[PDB]
Design a binder for this molecule. Structure first.
Ligand SMILES: CS(=O)(=O)CCNCc1ccc(-c2ccc3ncnc(Nc4ccc(OCc5cccc(F)c5)c(Cl)c4)c3c2)o1
Ligand SMILES: Nc1ncnc2c1ncn2[C@@H]1O[C@H](COP(=O)(O)OP(=O)(O)OP(=O)(O)O)[C@@H](O)[C@H]1O
Ligand SMILES: Nc1ncnc2c1ncn2[C@@H]1O[C@H](COP(=O)(O)OP(=O)(O)OP(=O)(O)O)[C@@H](O)[C@H]1O
Ligand SMILES: [Mg+2]
Ligand SMILES: [Mg+2]
Length: 1218
């Protein structure tokens, strides 16, 4: 894939003529990672990184010699200034041309003021001036794009070199350095700190060419107009602090909103995650109250910030008019006269200097400050401490030997007890050493000292030969399983097959689609813990080392696989290699030649397994311790009459803007046509002031109305969408993930509230200004309407052609960016394993390859943008040339004022055209959020909360339950769960639910709660459930779920969202559940805040709270789940006795994944794959051996089965025969 930029001329490199094949391919089909162009050798990551590293090392050596801190800024300056001279040269030329061209504009107008048809030398001079103007515009329009591309490429090169240097440092941190630093800070500084280097360079040169341009413009204005230019210059200067101060308030009003936004998002997350609970207990009204209040509070600050932004944009719109008006008011009031030559040069000079002073200089200042901060951060990181390089080893005979003597290290220098106390032992090839003792107190520290991971404070460690190390926690790096096993070294088929067979990885390969070539990312999402541990072992074996180190290799795998591995892959293969093993299982100590015991880092006893057996010490004992989108977006804001009024306001603002300059032209013509007599100053100045005031007011009004209307549309959309999602059936929440649901509330509404209206208003502003420029040009010279049609057609086709590939490249440079961060993070996590083997240059090369692959797409991202901009500027320059030459061709009709107005507007079209196109693309891109929000606004809905037939307030008066031909399915058309359930449940009786796992257990509860619409009839108190509203059905029957959830809020809110109970009743419930004492000790009495999901409360406390809530509700029908699985048996007995003694007079159903505690129920419902088999007294079912209940009881055993039978018999005798 050769780079076409390597074989390009200059007339092809200034027009970007080599990108045509790529654009053609992108138009024909979609582009992939094969289609991108490989980078040039001078842009490879290794070269740039090595260059900057050499310069930085020279600088740090010089600073060390000088006894002073180093300077990354000095290093980058000394590396890049000699290549940044040339771009400064060209930007100087460009600024000179920008300042120069209005002088020739003035010369053309000056010719036109004294038109004489008979003269021809004047016509020739005017043609020459027009040609010079065309040359200046072509310089501004064509070469500037190659200059800009090189300016951007310089920053990209700096960033790539920085990334290489940062990772090279990251691969060699020391232990304390890794401890003090964090795995998140490094990726933070590689994702949000080294990305300011793409933007510091683009606006870098405008720190010295800004004031120079302002000085040149002020001198030119003084030369032409006179003292009056200081009024315009003063307004332009005053515009700087005002704009700066209009940002320090927006920052405050934007950081005030984030609190409400985050609170709303967190509450939304709670609602979405615990949706089943809210729907079951009917708390959606309270949750809607909370969410609505938060949304209103946030929208207040959004409205304030939007009004501020609108006022700022109106100021930007009207600043030029204010400057021109005040300048010329002073110019005329000082006793001078107006001629069309000077006014329309002052206008152009003011436009240029105002743009530069308003935008580019503050942008450059901000970007330079941010880049300075980022350089400081990267320098502070780079100055971290590292390990000392492995020095020249002691001269030995080359034998593979392991020895440690008098070792004593310190993980923390401020700690008291050293990690190791005077260890002294050696091991040789063919010997298997083992280490046992406590639950792991200083277990891996021996391996750390052996590998050099621990700094030896005293003693000596002699290790010779290749080493293989297995981490306690297995680590897998992003790539492929084959590449993970290879670890960068060569691949041999026979060796790989032998390792795979000896590692029992055949089944693991079979379970994967690609076998040994499966692509595995971070954290082993496509694998399992045992598989990645086996991967680690396979890596260690395949590395073919001399010394082998193991640490907890078989704790995360099963028994047979672990035994087979430890036998075949160790006792046979490694019998000729040094081995040191740390294990927790004593069954592997039989094959261990040597066994050592360590307690608290102290040498205790070492020897053979037989000797330790004779010693009488037990190791086990020692181990104990489109368009409709736009229509719907606009309609929700306000009616169509406001749309008409907005159109009128836009047109009035633009018309007044243009009419001010037209009035200046009219004044100039009227003054020129004269004779002393004097023009009436009052009339002209009054009309001028009126037009200026109209421009300002209409601009402000248009901005405010657009902002308010779009913000109101966003608010209405959000309210409708939240009310729609709150009523969706649980099938929707089952089909969608929680993150996806919360995304459309966090990011999409985040766009709609604060970015879409501003982008839309800016686009409308610029489009109207372009339309005004073209309209003035057409009105002055009516024949310009002929080529504008070809220009528009060409522009439309060009926009389609470019955007058919720009979006593809924008996604290509984004899907190839994240692997850099992924590799950095993964290599940081597995740093110890990586450094254990001598293979770190391999990881460095892989990282550099990834960085090259990303620069491969960044290059396309730059060059395609330049390719589009070149053609756009060619079109705009063609328009300017047409105007400037037609004005001279048709000179027999026009006059000085008209020509000056047309020419000045044609000159100002520069830059404005491109900004309009870019903003249109941005708006079209951002409308997808509106599309998604509107899509969520029209979701499904469930049955109405309230029905026409309101129930009498005695509906659960007795508690009769009838199931008649009840069939339930979670999804329409899916497999059936219940088949013809027919049963009757009487009042006050306790009914238990039993069955096998997956046999439709937790389905009758959902059928009773009408979570999904059932098939059949269910009668409660001789009333059908489907004839009553859901809020009249779910409200007054209670359920205790598997795991209770506590929502963030007061305890009063948690136990009574509707505030239907008083303080005395709440305290009575708390003391009846024995939680009153536990509650009345917080700083708050009973309104203390709670963490998410009760993070500070125990599971028993959650069940206690649920029981208290049920008692407070006081429902006649109650259904409990298994509740307890691992809770303290004391708490289990407490809740059992409370359930027995509190709900005697209320119907109780008991579903459970449990036993014995469900033995006292009056009747047992037996479910076989959703079929109701047995429904009768437990004793009667136990009497028959063929009954499934008896077999399920016998599945436990014989003593427990006998106890259960006795309990059932006693319950039957006491109940049925009192
Ligand atoms: C009456 S006026 O002086 O305002 C007319 C000219 N400006 C019109 C206008 C309205 C809004 C903007 C605008 C808003 C935001 C922007 N953000 C970035 N860059 C902008 N423009 C810009 C213009 C010229 C530049 O110099 C290089 C150049 C030279 C010739 C042609 C080009 F396309 C570019 C640069 Cl670097 C940026 C901008 C404008 O411009
Ligand atoms: N990754 C680590 N970073 C810093 N200190 C560590 C690390 N691993 C162990 N240590 C320290 O080494 C010493 C060994 O004690 P500890 O019992 O925690 O070791 P271990 O080998 O990780 O334990 P176990 O075998 O139970 O997993 C302690 O002082 C501990 O803080
Ligand atoms: N939300 C659901 N959507 C689709 N199928 C489901 C859903 N919940 C359960 N199932 C399926 O329905 C069958 C039985 O469901 P159920 O949850 O009642 O079984 P269980 O394991 O006996 O009960 P428990 O939830 O008490 O463990 C199983 O095949 C299960 O996979
Ligand atoms: Mg350990
Ligand atoms: Mg289940």
């Amino acid at each position: 894939k050769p780079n076409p930029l390597q074989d390009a001329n200059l007339c092809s490199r200034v027009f970007f003529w080599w990108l045509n094949p790529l654009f053609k391919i992108g138009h024909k089909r979609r582009l992939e990672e094969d289609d991108m162009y490989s980078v040039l050798p001078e842009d490879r990551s290794q070269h740039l990184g090595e260059e900057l590293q050499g310069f930085w090392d020279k600088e740090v050596l010089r600073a060390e010699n000088d006894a002073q801190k180093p300077s990354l800024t000095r290093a980058i300056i000394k590396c890049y200034w000699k290549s940044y001279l040339v771009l400064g040269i060209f930007t100087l030329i460009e600024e000179s041309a920008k300042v120069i061209q209005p002088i020739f504009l003035g010369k053309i107008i000056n010719y036109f003021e004294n038109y004489d048809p008979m003269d021809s030398v004047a016509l020739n001079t005017a043609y020459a001036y027009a040609t010079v103007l065309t040359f200046c515009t072509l310089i501004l329009a064509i070469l500037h794009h190659l200059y800009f591309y090189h300016v951007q490429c310089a920053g990209m090169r700096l960033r790539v070199a920085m990334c290489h240097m940062i990772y090279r440092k990251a691969l060699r941190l020391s232990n304390m350095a890794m401890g003090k630093t964090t795995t998140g800070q490094i990726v933070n500084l590689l994702s949000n700190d080294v990305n300011k280097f793409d933007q510091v360079t683009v606006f870098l040169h405008f720190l010295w060419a800004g004031p120079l341009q302002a000085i040149a413009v002020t001198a030119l204005l003084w030369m032409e107009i006179g003292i009056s230019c200081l009024a315009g210059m003063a307004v332009l200067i005053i515009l700087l602090p005002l704009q700066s101060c209009f940002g320090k308030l927006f920052s405050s009003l934007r950081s005030k909103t984030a609190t409400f936004t985050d609170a709303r998002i967190r509450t939304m997350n709670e609602v979405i995650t615990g949706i089943r609970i809210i729907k079951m207990y009917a708390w959606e009204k309270s949750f809607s109250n909370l969410i609505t209040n938060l949304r209103k509070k946030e929208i207040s600050k959004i409205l304030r910030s939007s009004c501020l932004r609108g006022m700022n944009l109106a100021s930007f719109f009207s600043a030029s008019k204010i400057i021109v008006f005040v300048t010329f008011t002073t110019y005329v009031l000082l006793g001078s006269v107006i001629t069309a030559s000077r006014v329309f040069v002052a206008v152009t000079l003011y436009g240029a200097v105002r743009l530069t002073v308003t935008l580019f200089f503050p942008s450059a200042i901000e970007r330079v400050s941010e880049a300075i901060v980022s350089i400081r951060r990267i320098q502070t990181f780079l100055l971290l401490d590292e390990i000392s390089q492995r020095n020249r080893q002691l001269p030995s005979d080359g034998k593979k030997m392991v020895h440690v003597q008098d070792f004593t290290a310190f993980w923390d220098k401020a700690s008291e007890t050293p990690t190791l106390q005077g260890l002294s032992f050696t091991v040789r090839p063919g010997e298997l050493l083992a280490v046992v003792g406590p639950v792991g107190a200083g277990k891996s520290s021996l391996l750390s000292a052996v590998l050099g991971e621990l700094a030896p404070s005293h003693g000596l460690v002699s290790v010779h030969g290749r080493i293989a190390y297995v981490s306690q926690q297995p680590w897998v790096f992003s790539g492929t399983l084959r590449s993970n096993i290879l670890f960068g070294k060569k691949y041999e088929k026979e060796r790989y097959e032998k390792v795979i067979k000896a590692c029992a990885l055949k089944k693991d390969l079979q379970l994967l689609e690609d076998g040994d070539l499966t692509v595995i990312g971070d954290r082993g999402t496509t694998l399992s813990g045992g598989q990645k541990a086996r991967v680690n072992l396979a890596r260690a074996v395949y590395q073919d080392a001399d010394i082998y180190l193991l640490d907890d290799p078989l704790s995360a795998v099963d028994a047979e696989v672990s035994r087979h591995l430890f036998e075949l892959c160790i006792c046979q293969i490694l019998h000729e290699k040094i081995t040191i093993l740390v294990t927790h299982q004593l069954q592997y100590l039989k094959a261990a030649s040597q066994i050592l015991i360590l307690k608290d880092g102290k040498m205790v006893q070492k020897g053979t397994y037989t000797e330790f057996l004779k010693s009488g010490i037990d190791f086990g004992s020692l181990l104990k311790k489109g368009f409709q989108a736009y229509k719907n977006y606009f309609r929700a804001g306000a009616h169509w009459i406001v749309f008409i009024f907005l159109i009128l306001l836009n047109t009035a603002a633009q018309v007044a803007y243009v009419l001010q300059d037209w009035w200046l032209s009219y004044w100039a013509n009227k003054q020129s046509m004269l004779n002393t007599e004097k023009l009436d100053l009052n009339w002209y100045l009054g009309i001028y002031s009126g037009l200026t005031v109209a421009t300002v007011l209409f601009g402000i009004a248009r901005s405010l109305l657009v902002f308010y209307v779009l913000v109101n549309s966003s608010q209405t959309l959000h309210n409708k969408m939240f009310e729609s999602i709150l009523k969706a059936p649980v099938l929707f929440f089952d089909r969608n993930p929680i993150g996806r649901i919360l995304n459309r509330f966090s990011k999409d509404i985040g766009h709609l509230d604060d970015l879409l209206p501003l982008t839309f208003l800016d686009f409308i502003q610029t489009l109207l200004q372009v339309v005004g420029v073209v309209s003035v040009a057409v009105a002055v010279i009516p024949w310009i309407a002929i080529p504008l049609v070809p220009l528009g057609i060409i522009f439309i086709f060009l926009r389609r052609y470019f955007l058919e590939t720009s979006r593809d490249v924008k996604r290509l440079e984004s899907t190839t960016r994240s692997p850099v961060f992924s590799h950095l993070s993964s290599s940081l996590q597995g740093l110890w394993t990586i450094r254990a083997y001598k293979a770190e240059e391999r990881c460095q090369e892989l990282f550099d390859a990834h960085q090259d692959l990303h620069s491969e797409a960044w290059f396309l991202f730059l060059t395609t943008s330049r390719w589009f901009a070149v053609r756009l500027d060619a079109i705009c320059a063609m328009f300017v040339i047409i105007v400037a030459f037609g004005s001279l061709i048709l000179a027999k009709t026009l006059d000085a004022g008209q020509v000056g107005l047309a020419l000045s507007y044609a000159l100002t079209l520069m830059g404005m055209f491109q900004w309009c196109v870019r903003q249109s693309a941005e708006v079209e891109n951002m409308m997808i959020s509106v599309e998604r929000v509107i899509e969520y606004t029209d979701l499904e809905k469930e049955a109405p909360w309230e029905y026409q037939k309101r129930p009498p307030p005695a509906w659960p008066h007795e508690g009769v339950i009838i199931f008649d031909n009840v069939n339930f399915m979670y999804s329409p058309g899916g497999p059936l769960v219940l088949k013809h359930l027919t049963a009757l449940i009487k009042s006050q009786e306790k009914v238990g639910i039993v069955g096998r796992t997956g046999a439709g257990k937790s389905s009758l509860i959902s059928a009773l709660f009408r979570l999904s619409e059932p098939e059949g009839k269910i009668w409660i108190d001789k009333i059908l459930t489907t004839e009553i509203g859901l809020h009249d059905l779910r409200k007054k029957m209670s359920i205790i779920p598997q795991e209770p959830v506590l929502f963030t809020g007061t305890m009063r809110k948690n136990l009574d969202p509707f505030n239907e109970h008083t303080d005395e009743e709440l305290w009575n419930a708390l003391q009846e559940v024995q939680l009153k004492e536990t509650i009345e000790d917080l700083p708050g009495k009973m309104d203390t805040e709670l963490a998410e999901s009760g993070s500070n409360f125990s599971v028993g406390q959650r069940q206690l709270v649920c029981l208290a809530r049920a008692i407070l509700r006081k429902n006649q029908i109650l259904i409990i789940d298994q509740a307890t699985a691992n809770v303290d048996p004391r708490t289990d007995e407490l809740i059992q006795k409370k359930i027995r003694e509190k709900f005697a007079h209320c119907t109780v159903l008991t579903i459970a994944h449990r036993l014995n505690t469900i033995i006292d129920s009056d009747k047992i419902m037996v479910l076989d794959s959703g079929r109701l088999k047995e429904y009768d007294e437990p004793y009667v079912l136990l009497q028959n051996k063929e009954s499934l209940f008896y077999k399920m009881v016998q599945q436990l055993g014989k003593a427990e089965a006998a106890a259960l039978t006795e309990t059932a018999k006693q319950v039957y005798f006491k109940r049925n025969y009192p």
